[PDB]
Structure formats: structure tokens, C-alpha cells
Symmetry: D2
Subunit: 439 residues, 4 copies
């Protein structure tokens, strides 16, 4: 079968190695119990990441047969840009959105790392994701899509691992007993996943709905909720050329990675894009997270402002509906499934291709900003857009008569069958349901 319930002693095993305590201990344990682990680390432009070069070294020190560092930034940013172009975000609360940053990270990490392993000829793959979350499944699909022959081994799916190093304490103590002094004395009030597109905070104290963004130490921006933190208003311009972000505050860039890093700094100085979401997982249940994605948020606002001045109503509606559906597929680890590709490609080609122009914003604190100017050769919006006469409007209005008549007829029918208390004849038609009541 594909999933190996227990350590395949003597076999080469590849593992997505982040350098954290989970994968550090798992690799040492895997080597200790007889397997031949290979470490694969992805450079994802993690905001707080000290030195990526060191991660492969610790893997070697802990027993990796070989350890590679794969740069995934170009690909991550390209997918992030695609997400922006498609409005591929679905978890929203009052207008604040989660920019699907971890899902984007897994789509690029889960495929590129497995591709890299093909050069080492290793055919057993795994990671350190818990068996209770979304990530173990995202990696699972992405990996098997990239390598069909792949077999799967994950410490959190092996009862022999969980019983021995199940707790963080057991993992620290294991490192110790193996001759390695690890440094995890610190246990925050939440766990953090991050990459160049954003940072996600959840678990521990964030599991409680009475906790708030106040306990979070943002790593991509400032604590805008802290009135003692100085944040001067800032004017910023964002310019797109055929759906592609090409300039921020008049500056252009050598590549998209640099552009995104700058979008992050700009939004970061204000705390732009931070949100608190209760969301539905891929599996049963719900989870709660607090997210950061300053650059994605900045690009998203400008892109949509331009979209509203360039495309027609039906096209804008498809962008919203298709974008939300795509956002869900991305979240489920299905970013490359046929239904996702179809929506993504269609939005990139017919919507994003016309998004050329520049938007000027004034950023203050958090999600408080104002739009100061919107410019584009492709606007269909025109001031004071003469074109038709009052007689023309008389004609148009008159041709609504039969539709109005039919609707009036339906109101009468709904009133008769009890769905409306009173039709339109006596004023406001009243829908007959529990919500039709005051306080």
C-alpha cells in the first residue's frame, strides 16, 4: 500500500525538513531506528527565518544521509500573484479575508520538494504535519500528484512514533538523550506558520474565542492595535500592467520576489491585511486563526479597485463567484485539479489581462485606509459619461411593464398561498417567516 504504518527500516526516506523540533527529532529517530532519512528544506522567504543554509546542516548533524535546500520563492510568489489575479480567497468575515498563504506554500512545497527527491531516487516521502490537520492532506495530494510511484511515511501516522515522542517534552528529552542540546525552552501562546506571502497564527491560546489579536506578536507588521505604536499616514501607489504588479511607489523591480518583499514592507508598516477567522477545515470541525499578509492585502485592494473601473457587472460577478470557489479548492490542497485550473486560467486570461493601471491609497492603521486616485487606460468608467434622451428612457421604462405585471401577479399568488401576509397593494409586501418581527 501507499501509506506505511510503521518505519520502513533500512529504506531511504525523504522528509520535508523545516528544522523545527518535530522534524529534527523525527529525522534523528528515523535514523536511530534504522531508516535512511534524506532531508529536503524549502526556502519560502520565511519572514523570521534566521539562516536557511543552517537547516540542512542540522539535518546532517542529526543523521540525514543527504540534505538539500530548495529555493521555492519564485514559484511561491508566482502562485501568490495568480491568487491575487483570481481573487482566490474564501475565508472572509465582514470583508476581512484570509489570503490562503499556507495553502499556497504547500502547493509549491509539496510538489517542488518531491520533484527534487526524484534526483536522489528516494521513493518514500513524508513530513511532520499532525494527523489532525489540513496540511497532512495537502502534502499528501501534492506529493502523489508529482510522483506516482511514491510510498508514504509520516511519523504522525506511525503509532510507534507518537507513543515514544508524542509530546514536545518527549522530543526535547529525546534530542538530549541522543547527544544534542536543542533550544525550545520557549513555548509561545500559539504556533506559527509563515512564508513570504503571509504568516498564520493558531492553536494553544488562540483556540479560545476570548483570546484576540492582542496576544499576537506580528512578524510581518506592527501592532496597529497598540495606540502607543507610532504609525504615520503614508501615501502609496500600486501599478499593474496586464494583471501583473510592476511598481510600488514608482519603483520597479528586477523580479517578482523583490516586488513582493516591498509590498510586504509597505503594508507591514501599517499592519494591513491582518484578520481573525473562524473557518471550516478540509476535514470535520473548525479551527481559529489570526493571519498576516500585508503585501497580498495591498496588491488585492489595488487590483480590485482597478477591476471595478474596468470590467462589466457580469464579469466582476464571475470574478467573485469563481474566485471564492477557487479559494476553497486552493485551501483543500486542490490548486492543480482540473476544476481549479479551469477557473484560474479563465480569470487570468479574461479578467487579469485587462487590469492595467495605478491606484493611490493612503494607509493609516490596520485595515483603515482611503483610496486617493484610480487611473487606467482601460477604464470603462468616465466622468459625466447626452448619450440617450428622456424619450429613450420612457421607452426603456415602458418595456418593463409586462415583467412588473407578472411579478405583481406572483405577489398576489404568494399572498394567496400564505407566503406573504399582504401583497404590494397595501404597501410593503410582508414575507411570512420567523424573522419578520421586531425586538
Amino acid at each position: 500500500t501507499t501509506i506505511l504504518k510503521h518505519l520502513p527500516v533500512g529504506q531511504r526516506i525523504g522528509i520535508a525538513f523545516s528544522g523545527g523540533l518535530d522534524t529534527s527529532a523525527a529525522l534523528l529517530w528515523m535514523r536511530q531506528k534504522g531508516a535512511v532519512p534524506y532531508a529536503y528544506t524549502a526556502n519560502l522567504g520565511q519572514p523570521d527565518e534566521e539562516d536557511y543554509d543552517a537547516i540542512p546542516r542540522r539535518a546532517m548533524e542529526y543523521g540525514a544521509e543527504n540534505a538539500r535546500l530548495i529555493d521555492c520563492r519564485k514559484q511561491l510568489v508566482a502562485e501568490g500573484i495568480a491568487a491575487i489575479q483570481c481573487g482566490a480567497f474564501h475565508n472572509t468575515t465582514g470583508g476581512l479575508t484570509y489570503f490562503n498563504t499556507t495553502p499556497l506554500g504547500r502547493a509549491v512545497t509539496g510538489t517542488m520538494l518531491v520533484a527534487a527527491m526524484k534526483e536522489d531516487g528516494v521513493n518514500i516521502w513524508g513530513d511532520g504535519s499532525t494527523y489532525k490537520g489540513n496540511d497532512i492532506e495537502r502534502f499528501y495530494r501534492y506529493g502523489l500528484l508529482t510522483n506516482a510511484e511514491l510510498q508514504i511515511y509520516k511519523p504522525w501516522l506511525d503509532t510507534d512514533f507518537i507513543d515514544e515522542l508524542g509530546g514536545r517534552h518527549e522530543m526535547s528529552e529525546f534530542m538530549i538523550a541522543c547527544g544534542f542540546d536543542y533550544k525550545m525552552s520557549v513555548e509561545k501562546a500559539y504556533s506559527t506558520d509563515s512564508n513570504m506571502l503571509g504568516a498564520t497564527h493558531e492553536a494553544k491560546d488562540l483556540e479560545y474565542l476570548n483570546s484576540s489579536v492582542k496576544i499576537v506578536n506580528p512578524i510581518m507588521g506592527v501592532k496597529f492595535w497598540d495606540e502607543s505604536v507610532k504609525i504615520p499616514a503614508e501615501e502609496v501607489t500600486v501599478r499593474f500592467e496586464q494583471g501583473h504588479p510592476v511598481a510600488l511607489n514608482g519603483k520597479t523591480f528586477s523580479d517578482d520576489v523583490e516586488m513582493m518583499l516591498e509590498a510586504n514592507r509597505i503594508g507591514g508598516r501599517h499592519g494591513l491585511g491582518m484578520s481573525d477567522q473562524i473557518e471550516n477545515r478540509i476535514i470535520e470541525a473548525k479551527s481559529r486563526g489570526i493571519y498576516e499578509a500585508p503585501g497580498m492585502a495591498l496588491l488585492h485592494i489595488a487590483y480590485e479597485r482597478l477591476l471595478t473601473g474596468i470590467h462589466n457587472e457580469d464579469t466582476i460577478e464571475q470574478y467573485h463567484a469563481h474566485g471564492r470557489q477557487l479559494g476553497r479548492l486552493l485551501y483543500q490542497g486542490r490548486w492543480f485539479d482540473s476544476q481549479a485550473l479551469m477557473l484560474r486560467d479563465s480569470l487570468q486570461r479574461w479578467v487579469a489581462s485587462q487590469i492595467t493601471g495605478e491606484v493611490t491609497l493612503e494607509l493609516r492603521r490596520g485595515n483603515d485606509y482611503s483610496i486617493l486616485n484610480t487611473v487606467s487606460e482601460n477604464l470603462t468608467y468616465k466622468p459625466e459619461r447626452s448619450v440617450f434622451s428622456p424619450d429613450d428612457r420612457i421607452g426603456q421604462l415602458t418595456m418593463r411593464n409586462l415583467d412588473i405585471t407578472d411579478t405583481r401577479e406572483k405577489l398576489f399568488g404568494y399572498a394567496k398561498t400564505g407566503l406573504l401576509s399582504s401583497s404590494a397593494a397595501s404597501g410593503v409586501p410582508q414575507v411570512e417567516n420567523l424573522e419578520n418581527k421586531g425586538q
Copy 2:
């Protein structure tokens, strides 16, 4: 025919009378040219409205045969609450939404005023909406839905009116020549429509995309963009019972109108809910508006936060999709059409009925706020929600294999037909379209 192209001399004519220069002059002119005008004014809880009682008096002074003041606040608020329960808003830019406040006002005004006129037996109806906008059509549909026998007369559809009193200057001069000293010396940088649910600002200087919220003097809140305006952070609680807003900051209310007035004050102190939208009209073209809806915004945020912790993914998705569609129908003057009623009723019954709970927010400036607590007997979200084992997850994952296999097969097929440069085998599948490029 239904629409009378010219003044029906000698006939009773009802007119939606707001007291502005347009309807003041139109009624005087209608009486002057031989018609018998009746004025009907709606009390919509207009924020800046001096004294509604005076409007019917001026109508009488200008020639109205009779003048009535109809209170439409209870109905307006009830529809506003329904809108909140259904997320019936569709014009959004980066998460900021227009709360369809004018459309809600017209649905209640256009039906109630025509119903009232039935007591006076007047069968010719009109208003002072321009022939180039959305409102002339909203009033048209709502009126004909309420009274089938209705004939229609609108000064802005009568070439004899426009040629004589077409300009604001011609209207002031007309009042003057008729013995009335009007007071419109002031001509703002934009026009304003408002009611208890919100205020809309457009036209004139707002027609230009380089104008901003900075030229607007908000009438439902403060100028949060003005760093010189003091706005202390404020903690607020919003509580719902079966989809109905029943308490703000622990206070309950005698009726919904009072509740809404308080929601407005709370959001108003911060400038919550203000947005700048470029939108598609009912007819051809686009328009640009800057909107206020502090109470609607406050209720909307709390309602959706609760929704995310109470309902499942598919239900939340229907709320978004059906709400957006309903928002469009509301905007088009179709709030009581069968397709609208079906979506509204279904969301009120199955979604709103379970929205019971309380949300605590910390409001700062504009749309910058934080969520501090979310509580509800109906939450399906539970901290640390054991329930399944790693072996169970092995089973679940394994049963995805054939779907992954099929998707892998499609990637190969798309690569072969040229839609993807490279499948998943070599890393990240690359979609073949213009957007797949850097800067």
C-alpha cells in the same frame, strides 16, 4: 399608455415630495400649468433632516392640493435588518461594501407612498428622479407593483419641464418669479441621498476618480481620515437572538428603530463602514459614490463573525453567493420579485434563525477594528475539539488515491494538449497563458 409625456392638465397628480429644490419647483410648476398636485413625503429618519413636519407645509405653500407625511422608519429598518441577515450587498472593493441603503430606501418609499395615495384616490404618480439614473426606474417598478391602475408622470421625462426648469438656476429663478424666496445659495461638491440606514454621496466633484473621501463632510460619522480628529478606541458588544439584533453594549431597546439609531451612533463615532465604490448602474455605464452606513456595518461584522462559528461551509458559501445575487436584485429595484423573495426567505429561515450570540469588538478609526470575543450557544466551533485516530486518518487519506490518480492523468493530458508547459512530474505545473510571466 402608462407614462404621460406631458403634464396632464386638470388631473390629480401625486408626487414623492422631498422638499428639495427639484420637487419644490416641480410641484409649483405643475400647479402653475394646470395640474392638481398632491405631495407625499416619507419620514426615512434622514440624519441631517431638520424637521419633517415642515416639508408638507412647504408643499402646501407651493400649491399642493393636499400634503401628507408618511412614517417609513419601521419598515425601512425591518428591510435593512433583512438585508443584514441575508448579506444582500454586492458592490465591494477589497472587502469594503456598499450596504445598498438607497435601494432599501426606494423599496419602502416607492411602495408605501403609492399605497398612501390610494386613500386620496390619485392615480397619476411621479417623483423628481433624473431620467439618467437608477432611482427613476426603482420608483417606477415599486410604484407599478403597488398600484396596477397607476399612470406615470415625471417632470424629468417631460421635455416641457426640462426646457423650462432644466437647470438649478432656472429652478431658483422660477421660485423667485412665483413669489417664493428659496434657499439654495449653497451648491456642494457632490449631491447627497440619505436615510436612517446610510448616506450616499456622488456626482459633481465625486465624478472624478482623483477626488477622494477627503472632500466629503460625513453626516453619520466623523472624519476618521483627519488625524486631528480625536477618536478614542471603544469596546462594543453586539448581541443577536435568532438573527435579530437585540442589544448593543448591554442595552436593549423598545423597537428596532431605536436599536438602529444606537448602532449608528456607535459606528458613527469611528467612521465605521465608509467606502468608495465604482459600480455598474441598472442601465448602461458606471457611477462613483462614497458611502456611509455605520450601524449597518457594525451589525454586519458581528452577524458574519457569528455566522462563521455557527454554520457549515456549504451553508456559509450559499450565504455569500445568494447574498451577492440578492444584493444585485435589491440594487436593481427588484427586492420583491420572486427570485429575490426566494433567496431572502431561504436565508432568513435557515441561516439567520440560528444566529444567536454576542460579539465584542474594539473600534478604532474607520474600518480598523479588532474582534475581542465571540460567544454563542449555537457555535459548532469548540476549542481543542481523540475524535479520530491516526489509523482513521490513514484510511481517509488512502481513499483519495484514485482521485489523485485521475487528476494526475488530467495534468498529463493538459500537458500533451499544450495547456500546461510541464505536468506535476517536474515540480509546479505551469499553466500556459499570458499571466505566467514575471515582471
Copy 3:
């Protein structure tokens, strides 16, 4: 845990007993190995069902502690009618649809049988569905929805059962060894599931795409594909009152069960509604089935013909879109989930409530029929429906100019960015994709 991997020796176990070899052997085996099985059989109006009264008797003979026969026909038909009113069907090929008859049967069977067991105080539940199909999951959800305390035991989930009585031969031989002479000498070219709403045929020879309806012996109708079978044309009338089917060929009925039985006879004489579908299961993979549902098909055609003459475009579109989504949820065993109830209730209230009228058809062979008359007090369709003038049309057309202009502009932009070879200026705009080619 909820699912017991092995026989709970000594415990009361309820089982959905159909009387087939699977459940006959499973109950005998369960009793033989020490459990205390209780049989629960549902009367579903199975077309070919000999005598339902005998099924509980054989259960007793094989070892059941107690055996009950629950009549589920009224409920089955009521849900079938709801399905018709909502167009809750999603598996279609060229217009021919699967009427979700097994899914409807499981929704009523899985809830009613578990409810019945509550009177016997039995808290372990199961059925004889294979672990590779949809039904084991439909029963699972429906059962747990009805009884939260329920524990689950299913022979096809017990490795101790499958290894002993895995094959049909092993089951026959087991009956024999236990002193019972069963009669299953016959093994068709496919398996059959049926109830009063329809019959489904799949597995065995139907697994092959080169097999056809030709190997099926229909149990609810005739072999219309057999030119040697005489099938005279027949005129039939179907009449609805507020969405409810109340008369067939002028005859009314004492209850819906009788009405459905007659719809079945009428459609049955022609083979109406039979289809061949390749469909996606709840889990991974696809299956192939050949279906019968003569009465459902007859009611479905008349209902939709009426719908098209009574409701407006947007309402009809919601019926199609919401009906398809509901059809999928019904198929997945989610007929009572909140997202399903919302769609079902909304369609019953706003669409079905107005479906009053009568349709006359001429039925020939299979799906070949003609519509001969459509009548309804609620039609909005009117012959030769004067109402507007050519001048009015000039106005309406003129007001499309700006939208046409904007679209023309987009064509130019798509041509420039390479999406169209040539805009509209040179004739037919050419979309740039692989499909734009001849043979």
C-alpha cells in the same frame, strides 16, 4: 468508538434486513457467533417484492430476537414529490436524468428504521451494504442523525465476517450448513435495488461500457427498445395543484402512494424515464448504472413544462442551479443537512407553490413523447401578448450603446493581448485556443 470492528458478542444488534442472501446469512452468523440480532425491514413498495410479511418471518427463522416490518411508503413518496418539486436530480447525460431513487430510499430507510429500533432499546446498528459503495455511508449518516448514542456494526466492515462469508457461494454454503435451504441458484448479469420511486441496475456485466440496456429485464416498465414489443401511443394528462400532483388522466386519489403507483403504471407501459449513466460516487471512482423511474419521469416532465410557462427567467435558473446542487447533496446522503433543507424549502415555497395546472402528453416508446397541451391559471405566458411601440424599442435599443461600446473596447484589448486573433471589426471574433480549428 462508534464503529465496532468486530462482533459485539452478547449484545443486541439491530440490522436493516432486506431478506436477501447478504443479510439473511449475516443475521444467522451474528446469532451463531453470540450476538443478539434484531431485524428491521422497510416496506418501500418494491416493484418485484413478493410478500413483505414473509421477510420478518425468515429473519425470525434465522435467529432474530425480534423482527419488525416498518411501512415507509408514505414518507418515501412524500420525499420523492419534494425531489420533483425541487428538480433535485444531478446525474444527467444528454437530458436523460437519474431520479436519485436509491438516495431517496436510504434517507427514509436510514432514519425510520433507526427510529423504530429506539422502541426496542437496541443501540448497535448496521446493514449489509458493501464497504466499497455509497450506501454504507448514506446509512451511516442517516442513522447517526437519528440516534446520537448509536454504535455501529456492519458485517462488511468486520474482517471476521468477510473472511468467512465473503463470497455469495460461502453465504449459500453457510445457510446450508446451518440447516437452511436458501434459493439463490440464479445470479443475474447485474444487481438490482428498487423501491416505489424507481429501480437501479448495476455491477457485474453492467460494469462494462459495451453492455447496454439490452441485457436488462426492466421491472417497472417494458422493453421499449425491442421493436417486437407492442406499445401503442397513449394520451395522458397530469395535473398539479400548488406543486402537488393530484390527478392522472382525470383520476384523483385517496393518497399520494396510490397516485405514484398510477404514475408508475402509465410511464411503465412505455418505458419512460429509463437512462444509462456513468456517475461519480460519494467516494473516489465512478460507477455505471441503468435506471428506471417511470412515474417520477412522468411527473418531472409535466412539472417542468408548467414551470416554464409560470415563472420568470431568474426563478427558472435558480430552480435548475439549486435543484442540481440539491440533487448532489441528496445523492451524498445529505438530504437533511442545513444546506439541503435551505435549498429544498426555498424551492418548495417560492417555486412549487405556484405550479398549478395540467399538461397533456402523448407517450410513445421510451423517452419519445410529445407535449399536446399546457394549461394553467398561473401562466404568465399569453398568446399574442400593442404593449409597447417601435419608438419605445428605439429607446430601449439606444440605451445599450454604452455597453456595446465597452464590449467593443474589450474585444480590442483581448485582440491586443493575444486572446482573440481578430476583434469584431473583421467579422467573427476568433478566440485563441486549441479548439479553434476544423477537422
Copy 4:
């Protein structure tokens, strides 16, 4: 303005000339009153069309300054194929669909004829469509999309035309008085529009819902409802290669026009695809039509059978939903608008590109046929598709528990708020609405 209310005496005027009495008389009248008419006729492969070469001759005889015959068959068939690939059909009744054949004809006719006129430098355009239908608007949009400078003149928009030649009798008498003996002694029981993709029949006696297909003399097939007409069963094969129809009954073709002509003959011998629809027009009201499209129907059935065996559930669902929306836009004369192109292109690229294979059918009378075989290198369907174990299924089922629990909770809540009479605890949950009742 764009639309000229009266004959532009002395100016060159182009007119879509079909050769019927309407355009024959209009061109003679236009020339007689002083305009300089140019005739443009489209070769659309009309089934009953005698000799297209003669149409330009009669135009010349009646006064045309110049008369051209433009071949539009290749383009018409290419768009028809695109429609099939996208399932761009929306008017359906019980599974029978209108294949949008007139809308496809107008999209190609309205653009190509106007493009052709650019060579003659004529800038006034029109046609003979009535001011009360869909076509006058389809031609209007398509024409203005192709030529922005275009001015519009249509006899049915000119009160001076309608008053003089309003009736068919007045038109015959006009020809006569001008020295031309026309031949329209025959006035059928309905009017007919047709092209190579299909024939539409409406108006006159078809306006009555008690008329039926029985009064129609089909021009693309036989009277399958007439039991006296011999129609032997026929086996047919349809083969696609990358979404393109390439062989019928083993025969390939030099071009698509020939392929379509053959599809028509095959379906024609059986009357395949004929339907009776009540539909909503672009404007207010409904109309009734009886349609023929034998080849389109044949290709449509095979294409969808293949689609069901090749693509996954979500992709198939998008094909249905996007296809229906596209069908509506096509019907509205918006086949080249951005929202249409986006849906069409996305379906052609990601769905149609994989549709490779062959389907064998047995055609009998009308829409009575059977599927005999389905073959494809791209099928994801596999007979007897081992892959997972009962233990794996135990895991999968177990992971549904929390979702079931949440749904059970909602049932309890809906029961409490009165939406359900009884939850699931007592059997079948009962939705509280008018439809929950028997006969």
C-alpha cells in the same frame, strides 16, 4: 444619433437581405422613397433553401445598388461546435433542449454581413426583424460591435414604413403596384427560421398552447410522431478527437460543414432533437417555439456521454452551470461579450480538450435512443476499479462524526425555531411549509 427614425433619403443603406417578402418589399420601398439600398445575403446552409444565388438577383431586380452573397457556413458550424463543447444551451423542458440555433446564426450573420459592408463603404445598417422580438436586438448589438461608426435604419422602427406596408397583404400589393409579381399565396400555420444548425418554428398557430408539434412539417427530419412513417432502428457511432467531432459512422470529412450536414442526415432520419419550449425573451414576455436540430442533438448526446466518463464531478458541474449561463448570454445576443468569452474559452480549453473517444447509439423514433458503447483513452471510469480496505472505510466513516453531530445539532435548532416539526430523533425530519401535505 445611431438609430434613424425615418428613411435617410439619398443615403446608402445596407440591409440584411433574406429574400423573403419583408426585405424584398422594404428594399423596393427604400429605393422607391429615395434611399440607395445595398443588399447583403448570408449563406447559412438553410435546409429548404432553393438557390442562394438567386437571392442577390432579386435584390438587384427590386432596386439594390449592389447585392452580395456572403458564405457564412464555415463560421456558423465552428460556433455551433463551440456551443456543443460548452453545453451552451439554457432553454430546457424535462431534459429536451433548444440548441440556440437562431442565436448562433445571428452572431455570425450580424458580424460578417456588417464586415462585408465595410468594403462597400456603406454606413447605415438594418434588417427586417420585427420591433417586438429578440432578433432586432441581436442584430443591433452584433452590428455595432463590428462597426462603431454605423448608423441604424430598420423599416420596423420607422413609423412611415409600418403604416404603409405594415401587413403582409400591403407588402404583396406593394410589390404588385411596383410591377413585380411575388409568390406568397401561401401563409403557413407558423413562421420558420432556419440554418444548417437547426430550424425554429413559432408564431401564428404555435402561439396557442393547445397546438402541438403535430401541425409542424419538419424540414430537417421526419414526422416521428406519425406512426405511419417508417423509421427503422439505426446504429450510429460518433467520434471526437480533442473535443472536435471527426467521424460519423466511421466516415471522416474534408471539413466541418460536411460533418455537420451528415450529423443532420443521421439525426434527421429519426427526428432526433425536436422539442417544444416556452421560453423567456430578451425583453419582457414569453414566447413559444418548436425546434429542430438533429445534428446538434446527435453531437450533444455523444459529447456528454464521453464527458461523464472522462471528467470529475466538480468539472462536470462547472460544465453544466457555466454552459447554462453561456447559453443565456448566447440567446441574448452576447456571445462575444467578455463574460461569455471567459466561460466559452475556459470550457473549450479544460473540458473539451480531453473529450476524445467514440460513442455508439441506437436511434429509434424522436428522442428515443439507447447508448450501446462508450470508448475513450481518457476515461477515468474503469470496470471493477483492492484499492482500499474495510479498515480504510472505517477510518473515512469515522471522520464524518463531527459533521454529523453538527448537522444533528442544527436539526434540533430548526425544530426549536419551528422550521422542522420534528427533528431526526423520531424518524424523517419534517420541513414546515405548505408542500408538506398529501393529496
